[PDB]
Design a protein around this ligand. Structure first.
Ligand SMILES: CC(=O)O[C@H]1C(=O)[C@@]2(C)[C@H]([C@H](OC(=O)c3ccccc3)[C@]3(O)C[C@H](OC(=O)[C@H](O)[C@@H](NC(=O)c4ccccc4)c4ccccc4)C(C)=C1C3(C)C)[C@]1(OC(C)=O)CO[C@@H]1C[C@@H]2O
Ligand SMILES: CC(=O)O[C@H]1C(=O)[C@@]2(C)[C@H]([C@H](OC(=O)c3ccccc3)[C@]3(O)C[C@H](OC(=O)[C@H](O)[C@@H](NC(=O)c4ccccc4)c4ccccc4)C(C)=C1C3(C)C)[C@]1(OC(C)=O)CO[C@@H]1C[C@@H]2O
Ligand SMILES: Nc1nc2c(ncn2[C@@H]2O[C@H](COP(=O)(O)OP(=O)(O)OP(=O)(O)O)[C@@H](O)[C@H]2O)c(=O)[nH]1
Ligand SMILES: Nc1nc2c(ncn2[C@@H]2O[C@H](COP(=O)(O)OP(=O)(O)OP(=O)(O)O)[C@@H](O)[C@H]2O)c(=O)[nH]1
Ligand SMILES: Nc1nc2c(ncn2[C@@H]2O[C@H](COP(=O)(O)OP(=O)(O)O)[C@@H](O)[C@H]2O)c(=O)[nH]1
Ligand SMILES: Nc1nc2c(ncn2[C@@H]2O[C@H](COP(=O)(O)OP(=O)(O)O)[C@@H](O)[C@H]2O)c(=O)[nH]1
Ligand SMILES: [Mg+2]
Ligand SMILES: [Mg+2]
Lengths: 430, 46, 431, 431, 430
């Protein structure tokens, strides 16, 4: 049966992975010590998707911890839910990329990639029927981006027929957390555009907006952001673990949302999102969820879908509902916004329904969108890249590891081509 | 008095003309809403 | 005696089969464990052991979740463990995956199981196939299995109950590709295919049953009621019995036109049954109303070729004849000139049974109506228009190409569909 | 046998229909739930289920308030749920809204229900329509419905019960526009149209029944008594039965003059019943006083053209003949010279029934009188004068124009009403 | 079914809206917490016209709170019946108009209109069959007047077929609460004459007179005046919520009361109004209600109806009564006062009866009159505007926000044309 291997690299990857594993263990009724303490048989009928079974009812997550520095994973191990992970899955170096893509891809990554691949192969041998890989990292960092691209390259060379999902943290538009962020981002998209089956983009600014304006959170920390990202992660793959009226696994989503191989960048979203006091002021129905899906302010990437046209849309619902209500709602959305969908793809929306809702909620829904508005993000990143590349600023750090300006030119050319394709697919021609 | 009336008349035409110009581009694409689904009336053999 | 073999493939087929077999056990008074608590039902149930009846069904899917749900349900101790066949990875809405890559891995096992089930039968009459067009596993595997069956048996009739795609409602983006491919490769390997629309059944549930949350269970129960009404003539005795062969003999004028539409009557709620007397004439009239057809297409836009009426329960032939004559004199409906006689009737004494906890009222008589008409040419044209829209730019084509489908198959299917529309228009012109 | 279909549109129509149906159920001994606690009422009631009677009624309104009041009241289980049809927004005293903008949305559904109810009927002879001139949905949807019915059937009779606008009492400012427009539209589609005046009913209740708080319940009960007296010939057997077609063939000499006046007698209070031994002659006399008329117009100002008398209860034909002869020899009233025989008389055995909680005593004989007279000409002229007063300055015209009605329709209606006045004044001249 | 969206702007609007919502909630038996604790089914049968049902047996009023300063709605929220409103409907700025029409219509209104329209859309799409819009504001203030006209214009553009109702506090004839109220009143009428379906005019001076003379109240506060206005609104919209013997909705009143599109300014009134000590000496009958309604002293507007002639009159009776008595009283009124009714319109009176009594007494009645005497208010405002406009006093405050004198001239010309029309429509010409 279908099983998923999880990998996380860098600080952002490790933090989001820890939050994701806390969420998953809570959903399946697994205590931090690794012993099942649930109250339903459904939590165990499909537990082999994420967790292995050890001797004595103990459950070991099928996860791999990779970093070039030991600080983040030492924090993860010493913290809660640190004993579930098998200690053999903690692979680390001693140098750290230092926010250098070349260091993590060509100098430091080359030493750890063999060990990471060894752990990956050992985990996959135990799998009965592999469904694919999932990976959490950030594009703006050194080790995250470099090692993530290297690992996807190696695995794609190993298993080309499987399914690759990455949950990347693309750079924000207004405030940047690193000076060399455009360099790493461009060099990472150059590999993602050719080695990944599907990719979900995440913006810290969009997450701050959601936290401040919707959740009414005065002091949002990184824990809340990782909580939201983990909720979306769980919502994406709910159909592999619980029964439902209309099922949809990762391959179905990849078929339904990737019309051309080079356009597999999506904007995720979640619903419902309310504060601690305002949730009593609204009913819990399907149309409110549909309203929250197609809200540009609810998107988890800082791109306005109003500026472009949707290609495909995925709506994954959870809980006891009515299929007629969902279908009429999707029809109303499509007809009433006929100007925001491409004319050459009839029926832009794919629908899935799962019976088991999240713990403590009557219903929930996850939105995934393949909109051409992502071209604006790509264009902005490319513009910053070119502005910083004419003066050759900070270039001697990367060229001191083995890279040359030809790689940078190839990356910028590829990004310009991708932006051109995204723009050209907004033409009616009929 | 007639010239002041003509100035008012001109002002009214300019106002309506920018109003039409403003509404011309606004109706091009549209606005994002959701609403509810409205069923169609059944067809009959009559 | 005469026996029928039922095959359910894909999520839609498996769930409709669950509903059908629940209804079947209820109607014949069989407990879910296979033991009767107190015999013409040998057509569907075979006697094995001491008083245990095992249904003649095969459940096929390339994804194990729905079959696993079946194996843990109330009817766990009803089906033979070997009739429930599962794969590992579904077709993922890809026709090529379910036809060329994944289907060929278990097609031999499915055929072996069907052969083993059929060799026991002495008067096998045909096969019942439940699937959906838009699905990958559904369409791809049903096409492959129907081709294999036609090669193997040929002489035995083969019937389908497929879910036609709705004109507006959709749950997939690659639906037209699979629909066109499967109807192209199935057109020459089938005898009769009854189709329904989810949208039409939603409208029926809302307008008549007054149900505001029609989950899939209600739709499956209605489809099960239609199938039970179809097979009642085999499972019981009546003043006029119709077996499976007569369906294709009377409803199929040409080999390439075997797509009737199935309706039902009376579909009313419990509270409204008190205010209505359910006479044969009124239900016969309601069967022809466009608002009651369970395919979203207007019969008034075309002309009927042949019509089949199946009555259950308290029915007297004189009133049936009078109602049919009254329908014939009515000009609101139209019939082709080259078909002076376009009605085939069947009457059965057994009244419909009501599933407890259901939504349909108890009635003493009911009608199942099947119509072969040219109104579906509009739906075919709509599907072909969607295909053309999505194919002029080669959208989603690489997914199918990478699994072993050549690009020429799309063109071949499109030309075959155009030929079928031309047939539908040529047969719709009076002489 | 012979059957009738009753249609109630608008607030006034729905309320009077509720009163009439309560009276009908009481007369035939039918409980409000539709059952019977112990057979010629198949004309109005249709047998269904196990001894349940469903009235042949259709309730139409463009607002849900009054229909929901009916659906919640005591008779919620008497009426068929699909027979109460409701819109979302009412006409709001706008003829154009009820005829062009809003009426077209549910006219098709109303016609479907009418046809479905008529198909169940074997000897259907006419329809009964209740409405009011002043209202928007009343007048507009009545004109649209009568146009559609005349197109569809043509030969079946179509009677009207309408609330003629009062000369002084008014509850709307745009009453003349609606009245003139609906009269112009329906002048060539109504076989016969009886009218009553709310003001005259108020006067009758004040003077006779000794009531100072006559809510609309009392008026509706009086109107229900009148319609019961009209339809008693169909519902019960008697010495001289009168059908629905006989009314129109005896009262309507020309197709453009079909507006008779309806009265009733005796209208007395319980205290005064004991001191008056009511007989045939004096009730026949009392039917002819201007003060007892139910339309606020003096019959002495005009000449009678045709009179219809309907007797119920203990009635001897010789006494009826003597009373009619005495009335004829009386010169206080006048008859047109070209109609030497201006009387139609019917007698029914069944006496009127008294509704408990009502305001009328128990009598063994009652008379319903319907007279076609030229005295309605002054009322028509007054309506024209009001229309002219309101049209010179184009008041409220934009409300009608904004709903699609052309401005020439007002002129056409006014010219038609002037032609009607000419016809009435020409027919009233002896020669 | 038929449902109404309520919007209030400015200090006066927010105060009257709070009082009106308290009145309605008490009438429908809803506690301050929002949970139904009534005793009749008819209270819930038509609760959807004003309220939305949330999860857990809670009702949220369909109201929008609009203001350019946070003090007023902060006081509303912190006060009683503050937890009943949905917090997301509170839309506030930070600057404030400062009794300036230009500042509220061009400088802050432009910034707040997008948010307010988004909230209005979110409320309206959740509706089933919208009946119309209703606005509470004044004409003498800056934000009230300016934002009210802006919102009316925008909504009229968005929904041209719905019903727009306004309850505007026109300036008092004797005492002025602002020095620049003629400017705001003229600039707001210039928009009301074109973008509003019908408008009720209420004067604070007439309300003070009613409380001091009829109610015998020694110290009337603003709560009493808001109580009176709220009673009038409930009486107007009572035919949508309870079954009636003869019932009329907003559109029927508009059809029967506006002979020409530019004459939709009415004067409301309520009966019966009596003191605590004088209730014992009077009998509640229909003739008493009728004689109290048609009283010059009882009008809620500071205009004498005897100066002009009525065009149309609407009387919405509430309670259990006999329509014969109502009709006889209407006839008596029309024949006695035949000199105050236009000749070119017969049947000047429209009557409606709602079966359920007001909360309180056995009978009550609301009076709405469309009299030509209201032209005096407009004429007085025009005189004050022209007296202040030749000297250009306070004009720079308005022209510093982008406005020009041409707008003032256009508004004055339009208002004078309206006055001329109202005047000359007193000519029988027959
Ligand atoms: C009475 C009630 O509704 O309590 C809720 C609650 O108040 C709200 C505000 C919760 C609450 O969530 C947050 O406050 C929050 C903060 C930052 C980021 C994300 C959420 C809640 O924490 C979240 C929590 O939800 C869950 O338990 C879900 O199963 C959730 N799991 C976790 O959040 C979780 C927390 C710790 C450890 C493991 C899991 C989940 C959601 C999607 C997919 C998988 C799991 C619950 C019941 C509540 C609180 C406690 C306040 C919300 O949580 C979600 C995403 O369902 C915020 O949006 C919903 C709306 C809820 O009304
Ligand atoms: C002692 C007693 O029984 O007196 C009655 C009462 O009927 C009197 C005195 C009431 C009373 O009103 C006043 O005293 C008053 C004071 C200042 C301004 C306005 C009113 C009463 O408050 C009014 C109140 O009316 C109601 O029942 C309604 O609820 C009323 N709503 C509220 O009072 C209210 C207040 C706060 C929050 C929510 C509702 C209402 C009135 C009209 C339309 C809708 C609702 C009742 C029982 C009375 C008192 C208490 C004295 C009157 O009220 C109205 C508006 O009808 C004053 O004019 C009438 C004359 C009545 O005789
Ligand atoms: N009426 C009805 N239709 C169903 C039901 N389940 C699925 N469908 C139809 O099936 C279509 C989706 O394709 P599926 O039949 O589920 O495809 P599949 O059989 O699962 O095959 P794969 O996609 O490869 O897994 C939808 O458009 C539905 O209309 C059901 O329970 N009742
Ligand atoms: N006799 C009688 N007349 C009534 C009754 N109810 C309403 N009316 C008459 O109807 C007139 C008002 O118009 P309505 O019939 O209510 O109008 P409508 O049919 O509801 O159509 P709309 O104008 O769209 O509301 C009044 O002038 C009354 O004369 C009633 O119960 N009995
Ligand atoms: N949402 C989220 N983002 C993070 C977190 N930690 C780091 N980031 C983002 O990651 C970026 C820094 O990359 P980083 O992982 O530290 O570089 P690396 O260690 O070399 O891979 C910053 O722009 C942060 O916005 C986290 O816990 N949550
Ligand atoms: N600051 C400010 N003052 C206003 C506004 N609207 C009205 N006013 C002033 O408030 C005065 C009366 O309003 P208010 O007392 O609230 O009305 P009432 O209590 O309902 O009778 C008017 O004369 C206006 O000058 C506004 O939006 N802002
Ligand atoms: Mg499947
Ligand atoms: Mg009405």
């Amino acid at each position: 049966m279908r099983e998923i291997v999880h990998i996380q690299a860098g600080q952002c990857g490790n933090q989001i992975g820890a939050k994701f594993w806390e969420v998953i263990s809570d959903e399946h009724g697994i205590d931090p010590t690794g012993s099942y303490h649930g109250d339903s048989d459904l939590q165990l009928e499909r537990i082999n998707v994420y967790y292995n079974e050890a001797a004595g009812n103990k459950y070991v997550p099928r996860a791999i911890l990779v970093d070039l520095e030991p600080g983040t994973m030492d924090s993860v191990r010493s913290g809660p839910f640190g004993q579930i992970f098998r200690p053999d899955n903690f692979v680390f170096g001693q140098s750290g990329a230092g926010n250098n893509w070349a260091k993590g891809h060509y100098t430091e990554g080359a030493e750890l990639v063999d060990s990471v691949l060894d752990v990956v192969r050992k985990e996959s041998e135990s799998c009965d029927c592999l469904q694919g890989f999932q990976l959490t990292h950030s594009l703006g960092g050194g080790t995250g981006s470099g090692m993530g691209t290297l690992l996807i390259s190696k695995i794609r060379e190993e298993y080309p027929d499987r399914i690759m999902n990455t949950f990347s943290v693309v750079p924000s538009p207004k405030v940047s957390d690193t000076v060399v962020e455009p360099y790493n981002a461009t060099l990472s998209v150059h590999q993602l555009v050719e080695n990944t089956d599907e990719t979900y983009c995440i913006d810290n600014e969009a997450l701050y907006d959601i936290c401040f304006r919707t959740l009414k959170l005065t002091t949002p920390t990184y824990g809340d952001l990782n909580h939201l990202v983990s909720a979306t992660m769980s919502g994406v793959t709910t159909c592999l673990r619980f029964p439902g009226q209309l099922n949809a696994d990762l391959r179905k989503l990849a078929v339904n949302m990737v019309p051309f191989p080079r356009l597999h960048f999506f904007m995720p979203g979640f619903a419902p999102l309310t504060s601690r006091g305002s949730q009593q002021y609204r009913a819990l129905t399907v149309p409110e969820l549909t309203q929250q899906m197609f809200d540009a302010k609810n998107m988890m990437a800082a791109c306005d879908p109003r500026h472009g046209r949707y290609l495909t849309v995925a709506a994954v619902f959870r809980g006891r509902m009515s299929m007629k209500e969902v279908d009429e709602q999707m029809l109303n959305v499509q007809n009433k916004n006929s100007s925001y969908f491409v004319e050459w793809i009839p029926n832009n929306v794919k629908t899935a329904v799962c019976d088991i809702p999240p713990r403590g909620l009557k219903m929930s829904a996850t939105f995934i969108g393949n909109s051409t508005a992502i071209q604006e993000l790509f264009k902005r990143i490319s513009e910053q890249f070119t502005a910083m590349f004419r003066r050759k600023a900070f270039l001697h750090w990367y060229t001191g590891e083995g890279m040359d300006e030809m790689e940078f030119t190839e990356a910028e050319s590829n990004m310009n081509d991708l932006v051109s394709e995204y723009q050209q697919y907004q033409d009616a021609t009929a | 008095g007639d010239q002041r009336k003509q100035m008012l008349q001109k002002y009214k035409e300019e106002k309506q003309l920018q109003k039409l110009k403003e509404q011309r581009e606004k109706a091009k694409r549209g606005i994002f809403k959701v609403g509810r689904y409205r069923p169609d009336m059944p067809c009959f053999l009559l | 005696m005469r026996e029928c073999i039922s095959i359910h493939v894909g999520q839609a087929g498996v769930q409709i089969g669950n509903a059908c077999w629940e209804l079947y056990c209820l109607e014949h008074g069989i407990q879910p464990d296979g033991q009767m608590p107190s015999d013409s039902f040998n057509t569907f149930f075979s006697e094995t052991g001491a008083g245990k009846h095992v249904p003649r069904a095969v459940f096929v899917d390339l994804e194990p979740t729905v079959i696993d749900e079946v194996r843990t349900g109330t009817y766990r101790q009803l089906f033979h463990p070997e009739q429930l066949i599962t794969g590992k990875e579904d077709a993922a809405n890809n026709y090529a995956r379910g036809h060329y890559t994944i289907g060929k891995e278990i097609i031999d096992l499915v055929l072996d199981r069907i052969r083993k089930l059929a060799d026991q039968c002495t008067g096998l009459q045909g096969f019942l196939v439940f699937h959906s067009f838009g699905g990958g596993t559904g369409s791809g595997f049903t096409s492959l299995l129907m081709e294999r069956l036609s090669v193997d048996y040929g002489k035995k009739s083969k019937l389908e109950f497929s879910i036609y795609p709705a004109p507006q409602v959709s749950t997939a983006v690659v639906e037209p590709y699979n629909s066109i491919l499967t109807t192209h490769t199935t057109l020459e390997h089938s005898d009769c295919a009854f189709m329904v629309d989810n949208e039409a059944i939603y409208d029926i549930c809302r307008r008549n049953l007054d149900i505001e949350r029609p989950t899939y269970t209600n739709l499956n129960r209605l489809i099960s009621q239609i199938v039970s009404s179809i097979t009642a003539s085999l499972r019981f005795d009546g003043a006029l019995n119709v077996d499976l062969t007569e369906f294709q003999t009377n409803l199929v004028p040409y080999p390439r036109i075997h797509f009737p539409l199935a309706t039902y009557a009376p579909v009313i709620s419990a509270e409204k049954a008190y205010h209505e007397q359910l006479s044969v004439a009124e239900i016969t009239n309601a069967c022809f109303e466009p608002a009651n057809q369970m395919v979203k297409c207007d019969p008034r836009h075309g002309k009927y070729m042949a019509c089949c009426l199946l009555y259950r329960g308290d029915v007297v032939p004189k009133d049936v004849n009078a109602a049919i004559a009254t329908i014939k004199t009515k000009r609101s409906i139209q019939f082709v000139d080259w078909c002076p006689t376009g009605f085939k009737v069947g009457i059965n004494y057994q009244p419909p049974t009501v599933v407890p906890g259901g939504d349909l009222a108890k009635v003493q008589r009911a009608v199942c109506m099947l119509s072969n008409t040219t109104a579906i040419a509009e739906a075919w044209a709509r599907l072909d228009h969607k295909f053309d829209l999505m194919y002029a730019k080669r959208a989603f084509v690489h997914w199918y190409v990478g699994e072993g489908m050549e690009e020429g198959e799309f063109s071949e299917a499109r030309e075959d569909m155009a030929a079928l529309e031309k047939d539908y228009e040529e047969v719709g012109v009076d002489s």
